Amino acid sequence: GTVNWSVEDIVKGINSNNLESQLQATQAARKLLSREKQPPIDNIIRAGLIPKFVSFLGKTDCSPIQFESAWALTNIASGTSEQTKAVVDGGAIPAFISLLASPHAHISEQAVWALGNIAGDGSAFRDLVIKHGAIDPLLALLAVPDLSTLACGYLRNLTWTLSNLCRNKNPAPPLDAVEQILPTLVRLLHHNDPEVLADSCWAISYLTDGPNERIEMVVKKGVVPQLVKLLGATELPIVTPALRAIGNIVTGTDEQTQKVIDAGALAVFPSLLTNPKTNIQKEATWTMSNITAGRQDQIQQVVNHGLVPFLVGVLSKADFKTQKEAAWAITNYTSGGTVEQIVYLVHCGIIEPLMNLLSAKDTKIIQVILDAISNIFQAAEKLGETEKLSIMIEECGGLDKIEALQRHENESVYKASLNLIEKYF
């Protein structure tokens, strides 16, 4: 009855003074915005229908028109930044926040969804949704003794919207809002639904991406053990966000990194560093590079878990981006490690793959590798074995590459290669 309407018919119905005609026209608009392969959002906006839908949001006595207008506005707010801006300019934020308290769960869910889209536009609309006071009601919707009593889709939408209120970082979310949301996020992080877990881990990864004080908030809530556990998950939708969060945390201080190590994260990296998905491997190698840049006892915990052979493996066969992250890990390890640890690195077979990566067309990997070389050589001089290492770099065919690097565009490259070719070779 309201399927395949024209925008002109929808306007005639909404401009009538008949609440039921307006309801049917709004349902027609919703169906047009929720089914058409390319919904006509721009024409709906041009017709001036957003203010009318926003007004319908406030019709407590006609819950159906509330629901239909909320759905239509949700779908308009799901488009371009300009269309979301059109929804916001109609006054929709406070109306949806008021609707969060509806006695009807489908309407409350639709309001949560609309606010999720609005906040997902970016930091400005996120902060505006927060200023209108959405966090209190949203969290009130989860103030139940057991989350399992809530409908799966309801909880999933609430979790995703909260994750969007934690998203984007220029500016980052207000600190008071983060402190107010984090407890509920931990509670969701201990829920059994995989979608809730994935979205909550993504929220944590948002909140851990930035300065060490934000990381300290998250780590003070005591979530690192659960993040490691989820790192062990069988579902990549759960392992990917968890790995992002752990890597972010290890970009912080050595003590936050130590919190990760203590939770048992390293035991998971033999799988992650051999994972069939390139992204998991790359982000695990980046996490490893931020761990090997830590203290010598943390490098020693990397060694004790048997992860140096896996780094050699990644450096030997992997996607080039993963291989570059591995080169970074090696240079950090050599820069901060003892002589015993660097000797162990050489004994594990680092030299040949490190050499083979000097045939690449990226200046930064070349610099990183040559610095790793200088460090390994410096450790060799403390033992008087620099000649052994030079012979080893010659048998793998590396001196030829360093010699060709003697004539390289970038200055640092040829300076480093000349210092090595002259000082050690």
Binding site: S34, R35, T74, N75, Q110, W113, N117, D121, R167
Partner: peptide
């Protein structure tokens, strides 16, 4: 990363 915006079909 989850989609920032979602249409309800």
């Amino acid at each position: 990363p989850p989609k920032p915006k979602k249409n309800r079909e």
